[PDB]
Amino acid sequence: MQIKTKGDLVRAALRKLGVASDATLTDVEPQSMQDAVDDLEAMMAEWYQDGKGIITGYVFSDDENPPAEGDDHGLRSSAVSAVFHNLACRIAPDYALEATAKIIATAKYGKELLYKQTAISRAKRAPYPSRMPTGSGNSFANLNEWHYFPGE
Amino acid sequence: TLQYRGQFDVVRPVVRKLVSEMRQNPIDVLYRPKDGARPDAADVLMGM
């Protein structure tokens, strides 16, 4: 993937918004970088609710490193499109713009596809209740009676 | 992995009934003299 940093994500989001791209001859203003990076960090923190939300592998920049811009985002190749579409949708109101219908639809589709695999993983069935027997079919060889082994 | 395996018997009562029926009617050997032989030719063998 050519998109490898938060700066590239922000540039792609602005190009979707039609704010700062070569197709419009516009260059990115330096102060449109930091605000969009802060918006992206806030969005990713909101999604990754301390590990109980959407899992993406996004790397959260720390205080010690001075420049937040230019750090690797760490997202997998299948999350970049969703992340930058959502970023464009979120930062559109900054310029009093409105993300178009295609951008909004792509953002929704990307977020759903982002959480699809984690939803499959978390669709787990609870163990047997505390008042079941195992039946004579299971207990005829070892007198187990009241224990389901937590195999899988 | 372990799943519930019950045993809801429906054949054992029939087996018990048949066993009881066959137990209520004992069968044993009975030695009988042949045709033209002595009338009590089987008393000793029966006693043994």
Resolution (Å) of this entry: 3.2
DSSP secondary structure code for residue A32 in this structure: H
Rounded to whole angstroms, the Cα distance separating A58 from A49 reads 12
Going by C-alpha positions, the residue among A81, A71, A91, A89 that lies closest to residue A114 is A81
Taking the alpha carbons of A28, A29, A35, A37 in that order, is the dihedral positive or negative? positive
Cβ contact A7:A70 at 8 Å: yes
- Judged by CB atoms closer than 8 Å, whether chains meet at A151 and B1 is answered as yes
Query: HSE on the CB side for A115, CA within 13 Å?
Result: 14
Rounded to whole angstroms, the Cα distance separating A1 from A45 reads 23
Q: Name every chain A residue with its beta carbon within 8 A of the beta carbon of B6.
A: 135-137
Burial class (CB in 10 A: 0-12, 13-18, 19+), B28: exposed
Rounded to whole angstroms, the Cα distance separating A136 from A39 reads 60
Is residue B24 within 8 angstroms of chain A, CB to CB?
no
- Judged by CB atoms closer than 8 Å, whether chains meet at A138 and B7 is answered as no
Q: How far is CA A89 from the centre of its chain?
A: 15
Rounded to whole angstroms, the Cα distance separating A114 from A73 reads 16
Question: Angle at which helices A101-122 and A80-91 pack, to 10 degrees?
Answer: 130
